[PDB]
């Protein structure tokens, strides 16, 4: 199991513009297009992102290309961020993938806000950190995904995804 497979499980693949959980315009593997309520604003962003007139639809290959970019941007973001980098550096490989998963979903700024949790992961207090992460809007909104993520930080293995 690797980061790509893990995110492919959590986000799914969709070749036509759709609304994410929060109602935003998304495409492919969790690629947010715009927070704007306009489907047109959305289609414009898409063509800008793909380099072509897509008319709201993309190919598997294009989805995957956006996907490689997003994971890269996520990793580079953690590495450049002063609150995130140190935590990432302190973690084992599996747990490092988990932080990438969160950053991909909620953005660098969003994860950086989980001050207490970041401190606990750094100190390797797994159980305590799982309990604190669960106390968030994130968890309440996407409980099945959050639980997968949380269990992963908890045990350090891929069991939660081996099912899936």
JSON list of C-alpha atoms in Angstrom, two decimals:
[
{"chain": "A", "resi": 1, "resn": "UNK", "atom": "CA", "xyz": [0.00, 0.00, 0.00]},
{"chain": "A", "resi": 2, "resn": "UNK", "atom": "CA", "xyz": [1.33, 3.43, -0.88]},
{"chain": "A", "resi": 3, "resn": "UNK", "atom": "CA", "xyz": [0.07, 7.04, -0.70]},
{"chain": "A", "resi": 4, "resn": "UNK", "atom": "CA", "xyz": [-1.54, 6.89, -4.18]},
{"chain": "A", "resi": 5, "resn": "UNK", "atom": "CA", "xyz": [-3.52, 3.73, -3.46]},
{"chain": "A", "resi": 6, "resn": "UNK", "atom": "CA", "xyz": [-4.50, 5.07, -0.06]},
{"chain": "A", "resi": 7, "resn": "UNK", "atom": "CA", "xyz": [-5.83, 8.34, -1.46]},
{"chain": "A", "resi": 8, "resn": "UNK", "atom": "CA", "xyz": [-7.40, 6.58, -4.36]},
{"chain": "A", "resi": 9, "resn": "UNK", "atom": "CA", "xyz": [-9.44, 4.64, -1.79]},
{"chain": "A", "resi": 10, "resn": "UNK", "atom": "CA", "xyz": [-10.46, 7.66, 0.23]},
{"chain": "A", "resi": 11, "resn": "UNK", "atom": "CA", "xyz": [-11.31, 10.00, -2.60]},
{"chain": "A", "resi": 12, "resn": "UNK", "atom": "CA", "xyz": [-12.50, 7.78, -5.43]},
{"chain": "A", "resi": 13, "resn": "UNK", "atom": "CA", "xyz": [-12.14, 8.56, -9.16]},
{"chain": "A", "resi": 14, "resn": "UNK", "atom": "CA", "xyz": [-14.70, 10.61, -11.07]},
{"chain": "A", "resi": 15, "resn": "UNK", "atom": "CA", "xyz": [-14.30, 11.66, -14.71]},
{"chain": "A", "resi": 16, "resn": "UNK", "atom": "CA", "xyz": [-17.10, 14.24, -14.75]},
{"chain": "A", "resi": 17, "resn": "UNK", "atom": "CA", "xyz": [-17.32, 17.41, -12.55]},
{"chain": "A", "resi": 18, "resn": "UNK", "atom": "CA", "xyz": [-19.06, 16.62, -9.29]},
{"chain": "A", "resi": 19, "resn": "UNK", "atom": "CA", "xyz": [-19.76, 18.06, -5.88]},
{"chain": "A", "resi": 20, "resn": "UNK", "atom": "CA", "xyz": [-17.60, 16.99, -3.07]},
{"chain": "A", "resi": 21, "resn": "UNK", "atom": "CA", "xyz": [-18.90, 16.34, 0.39]},
{"chain": "A", "resi": 22, "resn": "UNK", "atom": "CA", "xyz": [-18.95, 20.02, 1.22]},
{"chain": "A", "resi": 23, "resn": "UNK", "atom": "CA", "xyz": [-20.77, 20.82, -2.00]},
{"chain": "A", "resi": 24, "resn": "UNK", "atom": "CA", "xyz": [-17.73, 22.06, -3.97]},
{"chain": "A", "resi": 25, "resn": "UNK", "atom": "CA", "xyz": [-16.92, 21.43, -7.58]},
{"chain": "A", "resi": 26, "resn": "UNK", "atom": "CA", "xyz": [-14.37, 18.61, -7.87]},
{"chain": "A", "resi": 27, "resn": "UNK", "atom": "CA", "xyz": [-13.07, 16.22, -10.57]},
{"chain": "A", "resi": 28, "resn": "UNK", "atom": "CA", "xyz": [-10.87, 13.11, -10.86]},
{"chain": "A", "resi": 29, "resn": "UNK", "atom": "CA", "xyz": [-9.29, 11.97, -7.62]},
{"chain": "A", "resi": 30, "resn": "UNK", "atom": "CA", "xyz": [-10.34, 14.69, -5.09]},
{"chain": "A", "resi": 31, "resn": "UNK", "atom": "CA", "xyz": [-9.08, 17.64, -7.19]},
{"chain": "A", "resi": 32, "resn": "UNK", "atom": "CA", "xyz": [-10.98, 20.66, -5.94]},
{"chain": "A", "resi": 33, "resn": "UNK", "atom": "CA", "xyz": [-11.76, 23.02, -8.80]},
{"chain": "A", "resi": 34, "resn": "UNK", "atom": "CA", "xyz": [-13.42, 25.98, -7.15]},
{"chain": "A", "resi": 35, "resn": "UNK", "atom": "CA", "xyz": [-15.33, 26.84, -4.03]},
{"chain": "A", "resi": 36, "resn": "UNK", "atom": "CA", "xyz": [-17.59, 28.93, -6.24]},
{"chain": "A", "resi": 37, "resn": "UNK", "atom": "CA", "xyz": [-21.20, 28.04, -6.73]},
{"chain": "A", "resi": 38, "resn": "UNK", "atom": "CA", "xyz": [-20.90, 28.47, -10.43]},
{"chain": "A", "resi": 39, "resn": "UNK", "atom": "CA", "xyz": [-20.68, 25.36, -12.57]},
{"chain": "A", "resi": 40, "resn": "UNK", "atom": "CA", "xyz": [-19.34, 27.63, -15.15]},
{"chain": "A", "resi": 41, "resn": "UNK", "atom": "CA", "xyz": [-16.69, 29.00, -12.91]},
{"chain": "A", "resi": 42, "resn": "UNK", "atom": "CA", "xyz": [-15.89, 25.28, -12.41]},
{"chain": "A", "resi": 43, "resn": "UNK", "atom": "CA", "xyz": [-15.63, 24.37, -16.06]},
{"chain": "A", "resi": 44, "resn": "UNK", "atom": "CA", "xyz": [-13.38, 27.36, -16.67]},
{"chain": "A", "resi": 45, "resn": "UNK", "atom": "CA", "xyz": [-10.99, 26.24, -13.95]},
{"chain": "A", "resi": 46, "resn": "UNK", "atom": "CA", "xyz": [-10.98, 22.78, -15.44]},
{"chain": "A", "resi": 47, "resn": "UNK", "atom": "CA", "xyz": [-9.96, 23.85, -18.90]},
{"chain": "A", "resi": 48, "resn": "UNK", "atom": "CA", "xyz": [-7.31, 26.03, -17.32]},
{"chain": "A", "resi": 49, "resn": "UNK", "atom": "CA", "xyz": [-6.05, 23.06, -15.35]},
{"chain": "A", "resi": 50, "resn": "UNK", "atom": "CA", "xyz": [-6.06, 20.55, -18.24]},
{"chain": "A", "resi": 51, "resn": "UNK", "atom": "CA", "xyz": [-4.99, 22.79, -21.02]},
{"chain": "A", "resi": 52, "resn": "UNK", "atom": "CA", "xyz": [-7.96, 21.97, -23.12]},
{"chain": "A", "resi": 53, "resn": "UNK", "atom": "CA", "xyz": [-11.64, 22.55, -23.67]},
{"chain": "A", "resi": 54, "resn": "UNK", "atom": "CA", "xyz": [-13.03, 19.74, -21.66]},
{"chain": "A", "resi": 55, "resn": "UNK", "atom": "CA", "xyz": [-16.58, 20.72, -21.31]},
{"chain": "A", "resi": 56, "resn": "UNK", "atom": "CA", "xyz": [-16.68, 19.21, -17.73]},
{"chain": "A", "resi": 57, "resn": "UNK", "atom": "CA", "xyz": [-15.19, 15.86, -18.64]},
{"chain": "A", "resi": 58, "resn": "UNK", "atom": "CA", "xyz": [-11.65, 14.43, -18.53]},
{"chain": "A", "resi": 59, "resn": "UNK", "atom": "CA", "xyz": [-9.91, 11.13, -19.30]},
{"chain": "A", "resi": 60, "resn": "UNK", "atom": "CA", "xyz": [-8.38, 8.70, -16.82]},
{"chain": "A", "resi": 61, "resn": "UNK", "atom": "CA", "xyz": [-4.92, 9.87, -17.81]},
{"chain": "A", "resi": 62, "resn": "UNK", "atom": "CA", "xyz": [-5.79, 13.51, -17.13]},
{"chain": "A", "resi": 63, "resn": "UNK", "atom": "CA", "xyz": [-7.21, 12.56, -13.70]},
{"chain": "A", "resi": 64, "resn": "UNK", "atom": "CA", "xyz": [-4.02, 10.80, -12.93]},
{"chain": "A", "resi": 65, "resn": "UNK", "atom": "CA", "xyz": [-1.91, 13.73, -14.05]},
{"chain": "A", "resi": 66, "resn": "UNK", "atom": "CA", "xyz": [-3.83, 16.09, -11.75]},
{"chain": "A", "resi": 67, "resn": "UNK", "atom": "CA", "xyz": [-3.42, 13.43, -9.06]},
{"chain": "A", "resi": 68, "resn": "UNK", "atom": "CA", "xyz": [0.42, 13.30, -9.45]},
{"chain": "A", "resi": 69, "resn": "UNK", "atom": "CA", "xyz": [0.52, 17.04, -9.18]},
{"chain": "A", "resi": 70, "resn": "UNK", "atom": "CA", "xyz": [-1.63, 17.25, -6.12]},
{"chain": "A", "resi": 71, "resn": "UNK", "atom": "CA", "xyz": [0.34, 14.66, -4.08]},
{"chain": "A", "resi": 72, "resn": "UNK", "atom": "CA", "xyz": [3.60, 16.40, -5.10]},
{"chain": "A", "resi": 73, "resn": "UNK", "atom": "CA", "xyz": [2.26, 19.79, -4.09]},
{"chain": "A", "resi": 74, "resn": "UNK", "atom": "CA", "xyz": [1.04, 18.26, -0.80]},
{"chain": "A", "resi": 75, "resn": "UNK", "atom": "CA", "xyz": [4.49, 16.72, 0.02]},
{"chain": "A", "resi": 76, "resn": "UNK", "atom": "CA", "xyz": [6.37, 19.93, -0.91]},
{"chain": "A", "resi": 77, "resn": "UNK", "atom": "CA", "xyz": [3.86, 21.93, 1.16]},
{"chain": "A", "resi": 78, "resn": "UNK", "atom": "CA", "xyz": [4.49, 19.88, 4.33]},
{"chain": "A", "resi": 79, "resn": "UNK", "atom": "CA", "xyz": [8.26, 20.24, 3.74]},
{"chain": "A", "resi": 80, "resn": "UNK", "atom": "CA", "xyz": [8.10, 24.02, 3.46]},
{"chain": "A", "resi": 81, "resn": "UNK", "atom": "CA", "xyz": [5.83, 24.47, 6.32]},
{"chain": "A", "resi": 82, "resn": "UNK", "atom": "CA", "xyz": [7.41, 25.25, 9.71]},
{"chain": "A", "resi": 83, "resn": "UNK", "atom": "CA", "xyz": [4.72, 23.60, 11.78]},
{"chain": "A", "resi": 84, "resn": "UNK", "atom": "CA", "xyz": [4.41, 20.51, 9.61]},
{"chain": "A", "resi": 85, "resn": "UNK", "atom": "CA", "xyz": [7.97, 19.70, 8.63]},
{"chain": "A", "resi": 86, "resn": "UNK", "atom": "CA", "xyz": [9.16, 18.83, 12.06]},
{"chain": "A", "resi": 87, "resn": "UNK", "atom": "CA", "xyz": [6.28, 16.45, 12.65]},
{"chain": "A", "resi": 88, "resn": "UNK", "atom": "CA", "xyz": [6.76, 14.78, 9.32]},
{"chain": "A", "resi": 89, "resn": "UNK", "atom": "CA", "xyz": [10.47, 14.43, 10.01]},
{"chain": "A", "resi": 90, "resn": "UNK", "atom": "CA", "xyz": [9.73, 12.78, 13.29]},
{"chain": "A", "resi": 91, "resn": "UNK", "atom": "CA", "xyz": [7.41, 10.13, 11.87]},
{"chain": "A", "resi": 92, "resn": "UNK", "atom": "CA", "xyz": [7.82, 6.60, 10.56]},
{"chain": "A", "resi": 93, "resn": "UNK", "atom": "CA", "xyz": [6.96, 5.88, 6.86]},
{"chain": "A", "resi": 94, "resn": "UNK", "atom": "CA", "xyz": [3.34, 4.79, 7.32]},
{"chain": "A", "resi": 95, "resn": "UNK", "atom": "CA", "xyz": [2.46, 7.72, 9.55]},
{"chain": "A", "resi": 96, "resn": "UNK", "atom": "CA", "xyz": [4.15, 10.07, 7.10]},
{"chain": "A", "resi": 97, "resn": "UNK", "atom": "CA", "xyz": [1.68, 8.89, 4.45]},
{"chain": "A", "resi": 98, "resn": "UNK", "atom": "CA", "xyz": [-1.16, 9.69, 6.86]},
{"chain": "A", "resi": 99, "resn": "UNK", "atom": "CA", "xyz": [-0.10, 13.29, 7.31]},
{"chain": "A", "resi": 100, "resn": "UNK", "atom": "CA", "xyz": [0.11, 13.52, 3.51]},
{"chain": "A", "resi": 101, "resn": "UNK", "atom": "CA", "xyz": [-3.48, 12.23, 3.30]},
{"chain": "A", "resi": 102, "resn": "UNK", "atom": "CA", "xyz": [-4.74, 14.95, 5.69]},
{"chain": "A", "resi": 103, "resn": "UNK", "atom": "CA", "xyz": [-2.83, 17.73, 3.87]},
{"chain": "A", "resi": 104, "resn": "UNK", "atom": "CA", "xyz": [-4.19, 16.60, 0.52]},
{"chain": "A", "resi": 105, "resn": "UNK", "atom": "CA", "xyz": [-7.76, 16.77, 1.98]},
{"chain": "A", "resi": 106, "resn": "UNK", "atom": "CA", "xyz": [-7.69, 19.82, 4.14]},
{"chain": "A", "resi": 107, "resn": "UNK", "atom": "CA", "xyz": [-4.80, 21.87, 3.01]},
{"chain": "A", "resi": 108, "resn": "UNK", "atom": "CA", "xyz": [-1.58, 22.76, 4.81]},
{"chain": "A", "resi": 109, "resn": "UNK", "atom": "CA", "xyz": [-3.15, 25.58, 6.73]},
{"chain": "A", "resi": 110, "resn": "UNK", "atom": "CA", "xyz": [-5.95, 23.33, 7.90]},
{"chain": "A", "resi": 111, "resn": "UNK", "atom": "CA", "xyz": [-3.69, 20.62, 9.20]},
{"chain": "A", "resi": 112, "resn": "UNK", "atom": "CA", "xyz": [-1.36, 23.18, 10.75]},
{"chain": "A", "resi": 113, "resn": "UNK", "atom": "CA", "xyz": [-4.30, 24.29, 12.89]},
{"chain": "A", "resi": 114, "resn": "UNK", "atom": "CA", "xyz": [-4.42, 20.97, 14.75]},
{"chain": "A", "resi": 115, "resn": "UNK", "atom": "CA", "xyz": [-1.86, 22.27, 17.26]},
{"chain": "A", "resi": 116, "resn": "UNK", "atom": "CA", "xyz": [-2.47, 19.84, 20.11]},
{"chain": "A", "resi": 117, "resn": "UNK", "atom": "CA", "xyz": [-2.68, 16.80, 17.88]},
{"chain": "A", "resi": 118, "resn": "UNK", "atom": "CA", "xyz": [0.56, 17.73, 16.02]},
{"chain": "A", "resi": 119, "resn": "UNK", "atom": "CA", "xyz": [2.35, 18.00, 19.42]},
{"chain": "A", "resi": 120, "resn": "UNK", "atom": "CA", "xyz": [1.06, 14.60, 20.48]},
{"chain": "A", "resi": 121, "resn": "UNK", "atom": "CA", "xyz": [2.06, 12.88, 17.22]},
{"chain": "A", "resi": 122, "resn": "UNK", "atom": "CA", "xyz": [5.46, 14.42, 17.61]},
{"chain": "A", "resi": 123, "resn": "UNK", "atom": "CA", "xyz": [5.73, 12.98, 21.07]},
{"chain": "A", "resi": 124, "resn": "UNK", "atom": "CA", "xyz": [4.49, 9.67, 19.71]},
{"chain": "A", "resi": 125, "resn": "UNK", "atom": "CA", "xyz": [1.52, 9.55, 22.03]},
{"chain": "A", "resi": 126, "resn": "UNK", "atom": "CA", "xyz": [-0.60, 7.64, 19.48]},
{"chain": "A", "resi": 127, "resn": "UNK", "atom": "CA", "xyz": [-3.68, 6.90, 21.54]},
{"chain": "A", "resi": 128, "resn": "UNK", "atom": "CA", "xyz": [-3.86, 10.38, 22.95]},
{"chain": "A", "resi": 129, "resn": "UNK", "atom": "CA", "xyz": [-3.53, 11.93, 19.53]},
{"chain": "A", "resi": 130, "resn": "UNK", "atom": "CA", "xyz": [-6.33, 9.66, 18.11]},
{"chain": "A", "resi": 131, "resn": "UNK", "atom": "CA", "xyz": [-8.70, 10.85, 20.81]},
{"chain": "A", "resi": 132, "resn": "UNK", "atom": "CA", "xyz": [-7.86, 14.54, 20.14]},
{"chain": "A", "resi": 133, "resn": "UNK", "atom": "CA", "xyz": [-8.14, 14.28, 16.33]},
{"chain": "A", "resi": 134, "resn": "UNK", "atom": "CA", "xyz": [-11.68, 12.80, 16.72]},
{"chain": "A", "resi": 135, "resn": "UNK", "atom": "CA", "xyz": [-12.77, 16.04, 18.37]},
{"chain": "A", "resi": 136, "resn": "UNK", "atom": "CA", "xyz": [-13.04, 18.07, 15.22]},
{"chain": "A", "resi": 137, "resn": "UNK", "atom": "CA", "xyz": [-15.43, 19.10, 12.53]},
{"chain": "A", "resi": 138, "resn": "UNK", "atom": "CA", "xyz": [-13.33, 17.01, 10.09]},
{"chain": "A", "resi": 139, "resn": "UNK", "atom": "CA", "xyz": [-14.16, 13.81, 11.99]},
{"chain": "A", "resi": 140, "resn": "UNK", "atom": "CA", "xyz": [-17.88, 14.69, 12.40]},
{"chain": "A", "resi": 141, "resn": "UNK", "atom": "CA", "xyz": [-18.24, 15.44, 8.72]},
{"chain": "A", "resi": 142, "resn": "UNK", "atom": "CA", "xyz": [-16.36, 12.46, 7.19]},
{"chain": "A", "resi": 143, "resn": "UNK", "atom": "CA", "xyz": [-16.32, 9.99, 10.02]},
{"chain": "A", "resi": 144, "resn": "UNK", "atom": "CA", "xyz": [-15.48, 6.80, 8.02]},
{"chain": "A", "resi": 145, "resn": "UNK", "atom": "CA", "xyz": [-12.49, 8.39, 6.26]},
{"chain": "A", "resi": 146, "resn": "UNK", "atom": "CA", "xyz": [-11.34, 10.17, 9.52]},
{"chain": "A", "resi": 147, "resn": "UNK", "atom": "CA", "xyz": [-11.54, 6.86, 11.38]},
{"chain": "A", "resi": 148, "resn": "UNK", "atom": "CA", "xyz": [-9.36, 5.19, 8.76]},
{"chain": "A", "resi": 149, "resn": "UNK", "atom": "CA", "xyz": [-6.81, 7.97, 9.04]},
{"chain": "A", "resi": 150, "resn": "UNK", "atom": "CA", "xyz": [-6.95, 8.02, 12.82]},
{"chain": "A", "resi": 151, "resn": "UNK", "atom": "CA", "xyz": [-6.55, 4.24, 13.13]},
{"chain": "A", "resi": 152, "resn": "UNK", "atom": "CA", "xyz": [-3.56, 4.46, 10.85]},
{"chain": "A", "resi": 153, "resn": "UNK", "atom": "CA", "xyz": [-1.87, 7.02, 13.17]},
{"chain": "A", "resi": 154, "resn": "UNK", "atom": "CA", "xyz": [-2.90, 4.80, 16.00]},
{"chain": "A", "resi": 155, "resn": "UNK", "atom": "CA", "xyz": [-1.29, 1.56, 14.91]},
{"chain": "A", "resi": 156, "resn": "UNK", "atom": "CA", "xyz": [1.19, 2.50, 12.31]},
{"chain": "A", "resi": 157, "resn": "UNK", "atom": "CA", "xyz": [0.01, -0.25, 9.97]},
{"chain": "A", "resi": 158, "resn": "UNK", "atom": "CA", "xyz": [-2.16, -0.32, 6.85]},
{"chain": "A", "resi": 159, "resn": "UNK", "atom": "CA", "xyz": [-4.83, -2.55, 8.34]},
{"chain": "A", "resi": 160, "resn": "UNK", "atom": "CA", "xyz": [-7.65, 0.03, 7.96]},
{"chain": "A", "resi": 161, "resn": "UNK", "atom": "CA", "xyz": [-7.23, 0.11, 4.29]},
{"chain": "A", "resi": 162, "resn": "UNK", "atom": "CA", "xyz": [-6.53, -3.60, 3.77]},
{"chain": "A", "resi": 163, "resn": "UNK", "atom": "CA", "xyz": [-10.14, -4.28, 4.01]},
{"chain": "A", "resi": 164, "resn": "UNK", "atom": "CA", "xyz": [-10.99, -1.77, 1.22]}
]
